A paper describes a structure:
RET receptor tyrosine kinase plays vital developmental and neuroprotective roles in metazoans. The bipartite GFL-GFR complexes are recognized by the RET receptor tyrosine kinase (RTK) forming ternary RET-GFL-GFR complexes (Cacalano et al., 1998; Durbec et al., 1996; Jing et al., 1996; Treanor et al., 1996). RET has four consecutive cadherin-like domains (CLD(1-4)) and a membrane-proximal cysteine-rich domain (CRD) in its extracellular domain (RETECD) (Anders et al., 2001).
The zRGα1a cryo-EM map resembles a figure-of-eight with a molecular 2-fold centered at the crossover point. To enable building of a full structure into the map, we determined a crystal structure of zGDNFmat-zGFRα1a151-353 lacking domain D1 (referred to hereafter as zGFRα1aΔD1) at 2.2 Å (see the STAR Methods and Figure S5C). Some flexibility was apparent within the zGFRα1aΔ1-zGDNFmat. co-receptor-ligand complex itself and had been noted previously.
Author numbering:
A (entry chain A), B (entry chain A): 150 to 358
C (entry chain B), D (entry chain B): 138 to 235
The structure:
Amino acid sequence: ENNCLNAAKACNLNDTCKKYRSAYISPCTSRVSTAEVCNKRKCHKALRQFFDKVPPKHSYGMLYCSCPLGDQSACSERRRQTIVPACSYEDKERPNCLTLQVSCKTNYICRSRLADFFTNCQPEPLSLSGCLKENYADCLLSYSGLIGTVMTPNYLRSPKISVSPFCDCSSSGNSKEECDRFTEFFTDNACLRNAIQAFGNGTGSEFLE
Amino acid sequence: ENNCLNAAKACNLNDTCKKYRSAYISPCTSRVSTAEVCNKRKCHKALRQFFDKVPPKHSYGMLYCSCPLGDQSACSERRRQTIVPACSYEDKERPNCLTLQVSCKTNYICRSRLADFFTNCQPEPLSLSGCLKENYADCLLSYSGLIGTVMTPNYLRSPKISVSPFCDCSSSGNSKEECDRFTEFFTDNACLRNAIQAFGNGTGSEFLE
Amino acid sequence: QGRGCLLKEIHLNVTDLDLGYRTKEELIFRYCSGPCHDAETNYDKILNNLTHNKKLDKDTPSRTCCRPIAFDDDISFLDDSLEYHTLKKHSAKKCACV
Amino acid sequence: QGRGCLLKEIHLNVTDLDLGYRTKEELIFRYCSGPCHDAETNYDKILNNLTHNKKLDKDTPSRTCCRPIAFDDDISFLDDSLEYHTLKKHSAKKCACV
Ligand SMILES: *[C@@H]1O[C@H](CO)[C@@H](O[C@@H]2O[C@H](CO)[C@@H](O)[C@H](O)[C@H]2NC(C)=O)[C@H](O)[C@H]1NC(C)=O
Ligand SMILES: *[C@@H]1O[C@H](CO)[C@@H](O[C@@H]2O[C@H](CO)[C@@H](O)[C@H](O)[C@H]2NC(C)=O)[C@H](O)[C@H]1NC(C)=O
């Protein structure tokens, strides 16, 4: 079955999830000027409201739905469309990730949410969970907390599960290693990968639920 | 044709007359206690409102409609029912007319309206009109002005046109002549009779319209 | 918009109402009539499609109606037995798509 | 009183709405249904009698309708072409005799 489609059905059949899902799809798809497809501010704000007010079983059910193929499938494209990336994510200019990090750290909430993500999803390859903090739920909470900030992450078009904020390491200068470490915490994080996979499984894991 | 029925039809087809006609028929037919068929106060008040706010062509058309028979006919009974006499007129106790006149003269409006009636409908048999003031409209105005006071008059069951307030001259004592003069100004008044008849005619008389 | 739902009127005898009164009095009866398809919603469209789809089994829910939102003044009349009657909320005064 | 006009619901696919969308998403459609004859007026009775009397020629004015007075929250869904759509005033939230 299409797990992402099943999660969308379950959401529209729940009064709370249906209301707040539409409450962000409308501003994230409503053009308000001839220059921008959306009001990106209101799109991020309503996205933050969705994950704050909708219980995780519905909000994580759509964000962390499992698919067999990570690209080109109907599952995976629906999952990629969860945050309405054409407004919330894709942008004309693609900043350097370290430059984006400086900008995020000047926002009190963005700085707070980014610190929680780096703390709660920290890898530890000695752990059977792959995380330093063997609590997948806290990692999934911290990661989903980034949605609606300038650090909004989304699934990349890859055969595996790989996510990243809208940035890259082009033109990093003498800080190429530091930038690559930053992105790899998103794109190649066994703790985050295990946490996302453990939720999609929908089973009683030792480090989740 | 039934002139009183035609006047009732014309009234219900006029927004102003229809509204204020129903505005007095409701309180004059609505029981509000187990002892009285109506609130007589509100019935008189709404009756006064009807003749004050409805143009005379409709209000006089019903009050002064002409019938061939003054009793037992469908015309004349409809005309007698114009003021809803079961509430506005008929009463358990029938006062002496002179006693009723003392009571009326203690009310500023009743005293004013009664003086206008005796002034404007004063007979003068030398006049070709039968009135001292050869202006039938003023007599009809002063008479209709009594409706809604303690002097509320109505058509009596007689072959002729004869009206009277709800009173008589029983137990008048040494003032029998004075009482008989009072009632005769209502019941046997050629000026008032001519004025009522002239309106019912619906023609251009020399002393009306 | 609901511009099609209008206020109409007809001159009738009171007996034409078939309410049991025996009288020769008359009245102007006013009613609301007209289409309301420009004031319909997705709800009304969905209704129309589900009736045709037979998906609502035997419920035939009402789409937007042309109805009175305000009623005319009360009317009174005297019957052949010399009794007065008063009718309330008998005639429309202003219309709307509801 | 209008106690017969109630809020009902049915679980449907979005395609069951026949609005042209191509998607596998679902929804709960809620509608108002039921009789409103205890909330009718002399106006509604007069209508019923004038239809039977043929006195209104071909106007068939509407009597009291069981209709929504408040609509549910907007619903959104993603179609097969990965485009989002939002429907407004598509489902009833509270009913009344109007
Ligand atoms: C009220 O009823 C009267 C009596 O039925 C109606 O007058 C009649 O109208 C019909 C057809 O229009 C005539 O053929 C009858 O001969 C008429 N009868 C009389 C005695 O005139 C009158 O039209 C009705 N009025 C309204 C407004 O409906
Ligand atoms: C949505 O549509 C699906 C697909 O048509 C419906 O599932 C079917 O229901 C019918 C009759 O109830 C079955 O005979 C079909 O075989 C079912 N098809 C499949 C693939 O299961 C489903 O019931 C619809 N859902 C709703 C809520 O209407």
